[PDB]
């Protein structure tokens, strides 16, 4: 049962924030009902196993997930995979099992500080109810809510661009790169 032991070791090195990010990045293959009570890496791994995206012979999805959160030490220690191999694998078209849209959203999310978050919340006061603008909400919560009310999606980006333009412009660079990639 070494596979289960390896999975447990991998899961034991995750805090709350990494678990939240992983949960967010799996919205494309996990329904909200199956995701509401998830509070540990083991439960998420079981959920992925239920859809047969994770097994001994199939580790690509886990590798991509761990790569996207930059936890390279976990990749190298247990999965015996280096950065170059993952970069080459993701460079190959058809190997991408996660939309670059979500990846771009997550990367943008990582580039906001608390003051920038407050400025973003203040800017989006007009179009969003204060109930969804709770001070406890993070960027990912706002993104999930906006996607829920279909005010922001794959083709709906103009409000996002306008709001993000105030804080920074490299965000516009990332958005333009993603658009050109499509």
């Amino acid at each position: 049962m070494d596979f289960s032991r390896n999975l447990y070791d991998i899961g034991e090195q995750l805090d709350s924030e990494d678990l939240a990010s992983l949960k967010f990045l799996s919205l494309d293959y996990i329904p909200q009902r199956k995701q509401e009570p998830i509070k540990d890496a083991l439960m998420l791994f079981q959920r992925l196993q239920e859809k047969r995206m994770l097994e001994e012979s199939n580790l690509s999805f886990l590798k991509e997930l761990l790569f996207r959160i930059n936890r390279l030490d976990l990749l190298i220690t247990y999965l015996n995979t280096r950065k170059e191999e993952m970069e080459r694998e993701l460079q190959t078209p058809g190997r991408a099992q996660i939309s670059a849209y979500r990846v771009m959203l997550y990367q943008i999310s990582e580039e906001v500080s608390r003051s920038e978050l407050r400025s973003f919340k203040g800017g989006l006061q007009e179009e969003i109810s204060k109930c969804k603008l709770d001070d406890d909400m993070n960027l990912l919560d706002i993104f999930i809510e906006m996607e829920k009310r279909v005010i922001l999606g794959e083709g709906k980006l103009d409000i996002l661009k306008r709001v993000c333009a105030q804080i920074n412009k490299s965000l516009l660079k990332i958005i333009n790169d993603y658009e050109e990639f499509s």
Partner: protein
């Protein structure tokens, strides 16, 4: 056989069983899964091509490959030819229910209480319970969905409204 049936009945989930009962309600309840499968084998058509589609409807590819020794290709071909077993109405209902949290169903049972008794709905119920209660009240059908669409719009879930519109356009 019988061992495969025992594994199937023991490897499922209570909410999964509830979803299965809700889906099989369309064909036309047995509290246990085993009795329902016996009924399907006896009166209905307990074909492999049908059970595979039924399990694929609930995203259980692990049991699909483990037990049937078949991948998603067979069920994909079966769906492409014809979805004999289930209806797209039930499929859309289950898909909508799969995308709601506790707050969503709480708001739904609060709002729909306008013309439903408090004891009729009771509490601690899933979206399938709301759907079957509305069916008993006889105002929700695969052709009449305007009231449901409006109620959904009220709780600010417009992506699901677009999904409803897309389903209505398809059929």
């Amino acid at each position: 056989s019988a061992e495969v049936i025992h594994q199937v009945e023991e490897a499922l989930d209570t909410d999964e069983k509830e979803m299965l009962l809700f889906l099989c309600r369309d064909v036309a309840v047995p509290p246990n899964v085993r009795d329902l499968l016996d009924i399907l084998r006896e009166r209905g058509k307990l074909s492999v091509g049908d059970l595979a589609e039924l399990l694929y409807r609930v995203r259980r590819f692990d049991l699909l490959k483990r037990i049937l020794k078949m991948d998603r290709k067979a069920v994909e071909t079966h769906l492409l030819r014809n979805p004999h077993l289930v209806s797209d109405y039930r499929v859309l209902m289950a898909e909508i229910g799969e995308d709601l949290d506790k707050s969503d169903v709480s708001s739904l049972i609060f709002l729909m209480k306008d013309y439903m008794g408090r004891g009729k709905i009771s509490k601690e119920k899933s979206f399938l319970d709301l759907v079957v209660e509305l069916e008993k009240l006889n105002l929700v059908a695969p052709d009449q969905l305007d009231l449901l669409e409006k109620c959904l719009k009220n709780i600010h879930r417009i992506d699901l409204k677009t999904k409803i519109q897309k389903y209505k356009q398809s059929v």
